């Protein structure tokens, strides 16, 4: 019987020892510790065309973060703040110890600098991870930032988690209706550096066709089986399955491959399709390479492993037959047993793999050129390290990835704390109305509320509070432990049925055992093996990354063992005989601090399980719901939510769209995004001058540090219809409160330039105030520019004033590239920063601050999804005051409540009133709130106000008491960054495009087809002519009478001139849109010849 505090102790220990962003750090640490050497070893060796010369790659190492200040500097170490300020990359060097082989001698090993890799913040690589708070303050870093992002070119880029279907596993599904295809199975083999999809189909006839990317057409099943090493149909049949009823469906395929008796017949049958026109030996060789390296490379590309691959293929075919016979349903693409999440580790190691392949290619080229020409044998001068250094960076800065996926790395969102945390903990689905649907498997792994509205609904999710992404372990150890446990190999089973006479029905009742989707063997009973694996993992003998499940469907029973990475797994308290393994002593030790969550999971009390293992788990929400049948217990019932869904107080009383909208619009709220915002240089920054921590606070608010970086203020809220400016989701705000700094904010904009040097004779874009060079803006615009060419801090900047004076020599005589402050934006210069870039160019940054006072039209939102602009600002005298004289800060229309069904807002109002009155903390965590509503109302009555939170209100304007009481509360409000100050776009007569002669850049509003049809529907004609012809591309063109081609007027001689007719023809002026003339001339650039036919402007008659 663990009460609320006991379970919250476990949850707090989890969030304390393990950070909020742990998946990124875990993946990056796994990459650095293992994958960095794994890529080198899978590369193996550097072999050149010349036989004697060779290179062996011994070991790899990363140094502390540093930069090359000079050409041959000692690589002094830097801090992440310096990388941010100087637009550097927080990267660390890589030294690879490769030993050169010349004339088949080993020689002495040498380590060379192969490139810089960007490192994740707060990881094992950077030193700031373990620094104390005071040292973090001294260096200049915010002590509370969780890390998990790279600093690339001065920008915080974070690799979003990418969710996709599991590779190396076969998924079966029905074929499209009304087609010769009846069943389909697709397997995606993820090799080292490339990915191959193999598609297995069953036609209307029971023949089975296997195809993959390089081989056109469909290869028969038995043909490809014989090509892989199988010699007669009996081996194929027994490899597919052991049940005669399911074995009988392979006969048509076997007799379709009856002509193929030997392996070479299958080989050259494939080779005919692979490449046609060469000799039989070349066909056989080509088929051999494509089968070895393009069929199932995850099993292995060597010819030795080929036989193994064949077995795999047979197993896949088995599933199709099981789908056809009706034994199994098609696999769900949405089940998390089928979906894997790739973090920065897997992606970044793939990127390093491709970069190292390119580097080795270039090194081989240069080495062979040097050898055939004759040069220095040393590898230090042939390193060409930048081939890696730029490449990785080019992937992180742009976000366009090597594998073809896009948007891998995004600039970190720092509007406030919540936006940064959510953007760190984000999983984007690569891929239908079925995939968008919320799946029951998402319980405890993804937040059900946090999802964008629109085309991305259900495709972008946030990792849950207690959700962990698997790191992964080597398959070999799990294979060995499974074989040692007693699993009989499939080839051994087939041999002992064939070589020795045994009962087939004896092994038909056995349970199949799979490992990572590959048929591993057979076992006596699935339940016993699953229990053995679970107990071995719990006792610590087996690794904790192994998850075992037992299906035991009446038609088929199997054992699935998973140890691969990317599985989203959640921790559950193990419950044995109706009593959880965690006991009172464990909770006492947690409270004292003797043991932590990691000690609990190591001891076997709490275990992380995946979806597949949770398939046969039976879980209880609370200890009072626990029964002996139950297998697990939940550490925290309200941990199914995300970072933002845990912000809401009493979220179970709201409607689900309200919570989703709250999650969407809580990232936009203004607040303190970082404690070091003053030294930091961000392109768009916001600051709330007086932010307040919520009065109604959930448990997780203090964990994420939100109450130390708040993004709003408590507002005295009255739910009443005071004037009518709060209708249709609008609010009324006290203007006296605004004049006292209620929601005043500051907006920071950054303008930065580099004094770039380009090839020439000492040619540089020196920063200096301008005197008489071309493109000169005007002497009035340079009034506030200092002598050195950059504006001094704390000066008013209005309109298009220049901040940095730069002159540029022509690329093909000075030109003005000086920075003009945006025309709409007006503000005061806040900060001026001057640095030297790595390449030696002068970098200047100017940050300008603008004060935003709330006004009519500014958008505000509560913690429940009630977004709305400010209808009006009302003085304190006009607002309706109470008997105690307290006037509302925000008035909200009651009609917004019943259709939206947001009871949590009224509950939060009452809770905030109670919190302010009694002063005691209020906890509004879903499913467990302290105190309850009734005690809150009783205490509110005791303190001196009405129990139902209403109170007597007098009309401020007339002084007359209202006939009814008005509810008053302290609901938390946030100011969104969609201000009306920067949301105005209005155009008078101005510039037009050079080509189309239409107005843009201030640009004009596009009228468009739908507005054109509205104007047509009203029947107005001159209004259409005004709105579509007079105010845009109004032109007059002279058209020849006879041919009709557009002519011109000659200014020298009053006579009109026709391009075709010369001077002999008469030309008439016609007023048309210039877009029509452009269309006519573009058709004339074709061979189309439009001849415009003129007619009398008058009706004539």
């Amino acid at each position: 019987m663990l009460d609320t505090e006991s379970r919250w102790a476990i949850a707090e220990s989890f969030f304390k020892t393990r950070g909020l962003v742990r998946q990124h750090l875990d993946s990056f640490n796994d990459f650095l510790r293992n994958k960095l050497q794994q890529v080198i070893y899978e590369q193996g060796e550097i072999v050149t065309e010349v036989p004697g010369l060779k290179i062996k790659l011994g070991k790899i190492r990363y140094e502390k973060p540093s930069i090359r200040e000079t050409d041959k500097g000692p690589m002094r170490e830097i801090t992440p703040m310096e990388a941010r300020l100087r637009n550097l990359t927080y990267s660390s060097p890589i030294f690879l110890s490769m030993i050169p082989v010349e004339n088949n001698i080993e020689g002495e090993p040498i380590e060379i600098y192969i490139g810089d890799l960007p490192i994740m913040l707060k990881s094992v690589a950077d030193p700031t991870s373990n620094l104390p708070i005071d040292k973090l303050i001294e260096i200049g870093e915010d002590p509370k930032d969780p890390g998990g992002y790279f600093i690339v070119n001065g920008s915080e880029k974070v690799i979003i988690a990418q969710e996709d279907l599991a590779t190396n596993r076969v998924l079966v599904d029905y074929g499209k209706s009304g087609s010769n295809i009846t069943h389909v199975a697709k397997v995606t083999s993820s090799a080292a550096g490339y990915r191959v999809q193999v598609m297995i189909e069953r036609l209307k006839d029971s023949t089975i066709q296997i195809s993959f990317a390089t081989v056109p057409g469909r290869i028969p099943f038995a043909i490809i089986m014989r090509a892989l090493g199988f010699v007669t149909d009996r081996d194929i049949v027994y490899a597919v399955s052991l049940d005669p009823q399911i074995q009988n469906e392979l006969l048509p395929s076997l007799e379709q491959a009856s002509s193929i008796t030997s392996a070479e017949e299958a080989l050259d049958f494939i080779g005919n399709r692979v490449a046609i026109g060469q000799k039989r030996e070349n066909r056989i060789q080509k088929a051999e390479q494509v089968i070895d390296k393009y069929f199932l490379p995850h099993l292995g590309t060597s010819p030795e492993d080929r036989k193994k691959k064949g077995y795999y293929l047979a197993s896949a075919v088995n599933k199709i037959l099981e789908l056809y016979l009706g034994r199994r349903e098609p696999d769900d693409k949405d089940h998390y047993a089928n979906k894997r999440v790739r973090l920065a580790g897997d992606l970044f190691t793939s990127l390093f793999r491709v970069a190292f392949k390119a580097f080795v290619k270039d090194l081989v080229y240069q080495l062979e050129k040097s050898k055939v020409r004759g040069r220095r044998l040393s590898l230090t001068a042939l390193v060409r390290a930048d081939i890696i250094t730029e490449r990785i960076r080019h992937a992180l800065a742009t976000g366009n990835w090597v594998g073809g996926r896009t948007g891998v790395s995004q600039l970190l969102d720092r509007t406030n704390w919540l936006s940064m945390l959510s953007h760190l903990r984000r999983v984007v689905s690569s891929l239908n109305f079925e995939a968008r649907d919320l799946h029951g498997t998402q319980w405890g792994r993804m937040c059900p509320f946090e999802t964008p509205e629109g085309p991305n609904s259900g495709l972008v999710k946030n990792l849950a509070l207690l959700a962990q992404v698997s790191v992964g372990i080597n398959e070999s150890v799990v294979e060995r432990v499974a074989y040692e446990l007693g699993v009989v190999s499939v080839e051994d089973v087939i041999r002992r049925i064939s070589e020795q006479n045994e009962d087939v029905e004896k092994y038909m009742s056995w349970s199949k055992v799979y490992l990572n989707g590959r048929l591993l063997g057979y076992y006596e009973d699935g339940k016993e093996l699953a229990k053995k694996i679970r107990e071995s993992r719990r006792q610590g003998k087996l690794s904790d990354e192994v998850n075992v499940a037992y299906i035991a469907t009446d038609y088929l029973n199997e054992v699935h063992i998973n140890c691969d990475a990317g599985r989203v797994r959640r921790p559950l308290i193990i419950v044995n005989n109706g009593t959880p393994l965690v006991d009172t002593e464990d909770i006492k030790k947690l409270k004292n601090g003797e043991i932590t969550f990691d000690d609990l999971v190591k001891q076997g009390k709490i275990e992380f399980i995946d979806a597949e293992e949770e398939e046969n788990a039976y879980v209880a929400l609370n200890p009072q719901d626990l029964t002996p049948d139950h297998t697990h217990l939940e550490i925290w019932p309200s941990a199914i939510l995300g970072i933002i869904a845990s912000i809401i107080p009493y979220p179970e009383h709201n409607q689900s769209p309200r919570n989703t909208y709250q999650s969407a619009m809580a990232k936009q709220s203004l607040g303190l995004y970082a404690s070091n915002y003053q030294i930091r240089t961000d392109t768009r920054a916001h600051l709330l001058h007086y932010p307040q921590m919520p009065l109604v606070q959930t448990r997780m608010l203090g964990v994420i540090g939100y109450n130390d970086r708040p993004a709003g203020a408590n507002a005295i809220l009255a739910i009443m219809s005071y004037t009518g400016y709060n209708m249709e989701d609008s609010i009324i705000m006290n203007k006296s409160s605004i004049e006292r700094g209620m929601y005043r904010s500051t907006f920071f904009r950054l303008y930065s330039t580099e004094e770039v040097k380009y090839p020439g004779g000492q040619e540089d874009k020196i920063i200096t105030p301008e005197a008489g060079v071309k493109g000169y803006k005007g002497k009035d615009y340079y009034r506030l520019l200092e002598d050195n060419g950059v504006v001094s801090p704390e000066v008013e900047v209005k309109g298009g004033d220049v901040l940095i004076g730069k002159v540029s020599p022509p690329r093909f005589a000075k030109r003005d590239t000086s920075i003009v402050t945006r025309h709409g934006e007006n503000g005061i210069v806040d900060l001026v920063l001057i640095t030297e870039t790595l390449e030696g160019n002068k970098l200047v940054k100017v940050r300008v601050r603008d004060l935003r006072i709330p006004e009519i039209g500014d958008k505000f939102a509560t913690r429940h999804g009630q977004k709305g602009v400010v209808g009006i600002l009302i003085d304190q005298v006009d607002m309706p005051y109470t008997a105690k004289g307290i006037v509302p800060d925000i008035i909200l229309n009651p009609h917004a409540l019943p259709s939206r069904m947001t009871i949590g807002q009224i509950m939060e109002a009452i809770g905030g009133k109670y919190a302010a009155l009694s002063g005691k903390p209020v906890d509004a965590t879903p499913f467990l709130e302290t105190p309850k509503l009734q005690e809150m109302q009783k205490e509110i009555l005791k303190l001196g106000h009405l129990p139902d939170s209403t109170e007597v209100v007098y009309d401020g304007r007339t002084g007359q008491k209202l006939k009814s009481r008005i509810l008053f509360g302290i609901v938390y409000y946030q100011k969104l960054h969609h201000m009306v100050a920067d949301k105005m776009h209005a155009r008078a007569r101005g510039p037009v495009q050079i080509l189309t002669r239409q107005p843009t850049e201030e640009g004009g509003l596009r009228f468009g087809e739908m507005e054109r049809d509205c104007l047509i529907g009203f029947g107005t004609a001159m209004l259409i002519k005004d709105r579509l012809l007079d105010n845009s591309d109004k032109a007059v063109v002279y058209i020849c009478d006879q041919c009709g081609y557009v002519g011109w007027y000659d200014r020298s001689k009053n006579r009109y001139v026709c391009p075709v007719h010369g001077d002999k023809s008469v030309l008439h002026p016609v007023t048309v849109s210039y877009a029509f003339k452009l269309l006519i001339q573009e058709l004339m650039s074709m061979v189309i010849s439009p001849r415009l036919i003129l007619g009398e402007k008058v009706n004539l008659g």
């Binding site: 303190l672 307040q692 921590m693 004289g885």
Partner: protein
């Protein structure tokens, strides 16, 4: 960041009450009695004193050179 000079709802000075209230609450006294005897009875001022963060203490380390 720094406590507002006046309560947002009613123009009552609460800035001078931050130091006594914070010092006495940190000393081990329940905020209700401290607020009641300090001289703030309207809950509009209580939410001003109760829900304050004092960010200015952290910011003085990270101050713009200017």
């Amino acid at each position: 960041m720094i406590i507002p000079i006046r309560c947002f709802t009613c123009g009552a000075v609460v800035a001078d009450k931050w130091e006594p209230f914070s010092n006495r609450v940190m000393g081990g006294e329940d905020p209700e009695k401290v607020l009641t005897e300090l001289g703030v009875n309207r809950y509009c001022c209580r939410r001003m004193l109760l829900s304050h963060v004092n960010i200015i203490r952290e910011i003085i380390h990270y101050t713009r050179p200017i």
